[PDB]
PDB file of C-alpha atoms and ligand atoms in Angstrom:
ATOM      1  CA  UNK A   1      11.828   6.202  14.793  1.00 47.59           C
ATOM      2  CA  UNK A   2      11.726   3.248  12.433  1.00 46.21           C
ATOM      3  CA  UNK A   3       9.219   1.261  10.419  1.00 45.42           C
ATOM      4  CA  UNK A   4       9.509  -2.033   8.560  1.00 45.10           C
ATOM      5  CA  UNK A   5       7.359  -1.773   5.438  1.00 42.31           C
ATOM      6  CA  UNK A   6       7.068   0.287   2.246  1.00 40.10           C
ATOM      7  CA  UNK A   7       7.199   3.942   3.372  1.00 41.21           C
ATOM      8  CA  UNK A   8       3.713   4.967   2.258  1.00 42.14           C
ATOM      9  CA  UNK A   9       1.482   7.469   4.020  1.00 42.77           C
ATOM     10  CA  UNK A  10      -2.110   6.239   3.792  1.00 41.25           C
ATOM     11  CA  UNK A  11      -5.497   7.829   4.412  1.00 41.11           C
ATOM     12  CA  UNK A  12      -9.025   6.419   4.279  1.00 43.39           C
ATOM     13  CA  UNK A  13     -11.766   8.166   2.303  1.00 47.47           C
ATOM     14  CA  UNK A  14     -15.121   6.452   1.513  1.00 48.53           C
ATOM     15  CA  UNK A  15     -13.923   2.855   2.194  1.00 48.34           C
ATOM     16  CA  UNK A  16     -10.801   3.304   0.069  1.00 47.38           C
ATOM     17  CA  UNK A  17      -7.225   3.258   1.313  1.00 47.27           C
ATOM     18  CA  UNK A  18      -5.457   6.032  -0.607  1.00 46.59           C
ATOM     19  CA  UNK A  19      -1.862   7.194  -0.869  1.00 44.05           C
ATOM     20  CA  UNK A  20      -1.503  10.678   0.672  1.00 41.11           C
ATOM     21  CA  UNK A  21       2.301  10.863   0.455  1.00 39.23           C
ATOM     22  CA  UNK A  22       5.454   8.787   0.376  1.00 39.66           C
ATOM     23  CA  UNK A  23       8.139   8.764   3.053  1.00 39.30           C
ATOM     24  CA  UNK A  24      11.367  10.310   1.818  1.00 40.03           C
ATOM     25  CA  UNK A  25      13.907   7.647   0.797  1.00 41.07           C
ATOM     26  CA  UNK A  26      11.575   4.673   1.365  1.00 41.86           C
ATOM     27  CA  UNK A  27      10.928   1.691  -0.971  1.00 40.53           C
ATOM     28  CA  UNK A  28       7.668   3.161  -2.276  1.00 41.97           C
ATOM     29  CA  UNK A  29       9.360   6.462  -3.214  1.00 42.93           C
ATOM     30  CA  UNK A  30      12.349   4.675  -4.809  1.00 46.18           C
ATOM     31  CA  UNK A  31      10.051   2.437  -6.916  1.00 45.91           C
ATOM     32  CA  UNK A  32       8.442   5.299  -8.934  1.00 44.53           C
ATOM     33  CA  UNK A  33       5.331   3.049  -9.194  1.00 49.86           C
ATOM     34  CA  UNK A  34       3.151   4.715  -6.550  1.00 50.08           C
ATOM     35  CA  UNK A  35       1.842   8.223  -6.056  1.00 47.28           C
ATOM     36  CA  UNK A  36      -0.622  10.456  -4.294  1.00 50.07           C
ATOM     37  CA  UNK A  37      -4.205   9.567  -5.186  1.00 51.63           C
ATOM     38  CA  UNK A  38      -3.513   5.881  -5.937  1.00 53.30           C
ATOM     39  CA  UNK A  39      -6.038   3.592  -4.225  1.00 49.29           C
ATOM     40  CA  UNK A  40      -4.810   0.320  -2.664  1.00 45.97           C
ATOM     41  CA  UNK A  41      -7.776  -2.031  -3.072  1.00 48.17           C
ATOM     42  CA  UNK A  42      -5.967  -5.283  -2.337  1.00 48.23           C
ATOM     43  CA  UNK A  43      -2.871  -6.570  -0.580  1.00 48.88           C
ATOM     44  CA  UNK A  44      -1.147  -9.900  -1.148  1.00 50.00           C
ATOM     45  CA  UNK A  45       1.749 -11.614   0.575  1.00 52.46           C
ATOM     46  CA  UNK A  46       4.302 -13.517  -1.523  1.00 54.91           C
ATOM     47  CA  UNK A  47       2.836 -16.710  -3.056  1.00 56.26           C
ATOM     48  CA  UNK A  48      -0.611 -15.832  -1.699  1.00 52.54           C
ATOM     49  CA  UNK A  49      -3.797 -14.323  -2.956  1.00 51.87           C
ATOM     50  CA  UNK A  50      -4.406 -10.591  -3.135  1.00 54.18           C
ATOM     51  CA  UNK A  51      -6.918  -9.970  -0.355  1.00 56.34           C
ATOM     52  CA  UNK A  52      -9.610  -7.323  -0.962  1.00 54.48           C
ATOM     53  CA  UNK A  53      -9.283  -4.521   1.644  1.00 55.21           C
ATOM     54  CA  UNK A  54     -12.065  -2.151   0.541  1.00 57.65           C
ATOM     55  CA  UNK A  55     -14.219  -1.064   3.498  1.00 56.91           C
ATOM     56  CA  UNK A  56     -11.673  -2.275   6.080  1.00 58.41           C
ATOM     57  CA  UNK A  57     -10.365  -0.176   8.949  1.00 54.74           C
ATOM     58  CA  UNK A  58      -7.124   1.506   7.934  1.00 56.47           C
ATOM     59  CA  UNK A  59      -5.020  -0.056  10.714  1.00 54.87           C
ATOM     60  CA  UNK A  60      -6.008  -3.571   9.488  1.00 56.27           C
ATOM     61  CA  UNK A  61      -4.902  -2.665   5.935  1.00 56.61           C
ATOM     62  CA  UNK A  62      -1.596  -1.252   7.204  1.00 54.91           C
ATOM     63  CA  UNK A  63      -0.926  -4.525   9.060  1.00 54.43           C
ATOM     64  CA  UNK A  64      -0.952  -6.391   5.686  1.00 55.26           C
ATOM     65  CA  UNK A  65       1.358  -3.846   4.023  1.00 52.12           C
ATOM     66  CA  UNK A  66       4.011  -3.630   6.735  1.00 51.28           C
ATOM     67  CA  UNK A  67       6.299  -6.612   7.113  1.00 52.28           C
ATOM     68  CA  UNK A  68       9.855  -7.897   7.383  1.00 54.75           C
ATOM     69  CA  UNK A  69      12.757  -6.253   5.570  1.00 58.93           C
ATOM     70  CA  UNK A  70      13.450  -8.073   2.285  1.00 58.45           C
ATOM     71  CA  UNK A  71       9.967  -9.646   1.962  1.00 59.49           C
ATOM     72  CA  UNK A  72       7.670  -8.706  -0.922  1.00 59.50           C
ATOM     73  CA  UNK A  73       4.208  -7.245  -0.844  1.00 58.69           C
ATOM     74  CA  UNK A  74       1.785  -7.132  -3.769  1.00 57.06           C
ATOM     75  CA  UNK A  75      -0.413  -4.032  -3.904  1.00 60.51           C
ATOM     76  CA  UNK A  76      -3.497  -4.046  -6.131  1.00 63.91           C
ATOM     77  CA  UNK A  77      -3.639  -0.422  -7.262  1.00 59.40           C
ATOM     78  CA  UNK A  78      -6.602   1.437  -8.663  1.00 56.49           C
ATOM     79  CA  UNK A  79      -5.434   4.815 -10.068  1.00 57.25           C
ATOM     80  CA  UNK A  80      -7.529   7.917  -9.408  1.00 56.67           C
ATOM     81  CA  UNK A  81     -10.478   8.221 -11.820  1.00 58.85           C
ATOM     82  CA  UNK A  82     -14.108   7.179 -12.064  1.00 58.63           C
ATOM     83  CA  UNK A  83     -13.444   4.474 -14.718  1.00 58.87           C
ATOM     84  CA  UNK A  84      -9.996   3.315 -13.619  1.00 59.95           C
ATOM     85  CA  UNK A  85      -8.962  -0.325 -13.940  1.00 59.05           C
ATOM     86  CA  UNK A  86      -6.481  -2.039 -11.600  1.00 58.17           C
ATOM     87  CA  UNK A  87      -2.915  -3.365 -11.757  1.00 61.38           C
ATOM     88  CA  UNK A  88      -0.431  -4.920  -9.345  1.00 59.49           C
ATOM     89  CA  UNK A  89       2.648  -3.166  -7.953  1.00 60.61           C
ATOM     90  CA  UNK A  90       5.200  -5.290  -6.067  1.00 57.31           C
ATOM     91  CA  UNK A  91       7.409  -3.562  -3.462  1.00 57.41           C
ATOM     92  CA  UNK A  92      10.279  -5.070  -1.450  1.00 60.28           C
ATOM     93  CA  UNK A  93       9.891  -3.991   2.199  1.00 60.34           C
ATOM     94  CA  UNK A  94      12.763  -2.410   4.120  1.00 61.65           C
ATOM     95  CA  UNK A  95      13.517  -1.036   7.568  1.00 64.74           C
ATOM     96  CA  UNK A  96      13.227   2.733   7.100  1.00 69.11           C
ATOM     97  CA  UNK A  97      14.203   5.592   9.424  1.00 72.58           C
ATOM     98  CA  UNK A  98      11.369   8.106   9.484  1.00 76.66           C
TER      99      UNK A  98
HETATM  100 CL1   CL B   1       7.160  -1.375  12.261  1.00 80.43          CL
HETATM  101 CL1   CL B   2     -10.268   3.959   9.298  1.00 77.52          CL
END
């Protein structure tokens, strides 16, 4: 089994896409910039705007995150917490064995 993307396990709770876990050895795990509880509120492709994904269906969000090996994805991350502010994390996608 393989996947071309970042190696993040996502779950949807109350309109938010949230990191549940990271796939062992994947780009997300290797980055050290993502963790359980982080909310992904926007996704941008290279050179493009960061599209708001709050309230979307999870499969539609995943389709923006996955992509070709070597291409970059911008994730607008909102850490866990009532008054959290957001920041961007850039991950280089890879083909990962699950
Ligand atoms: Cl895939
Ligand atoms: Cl959903």
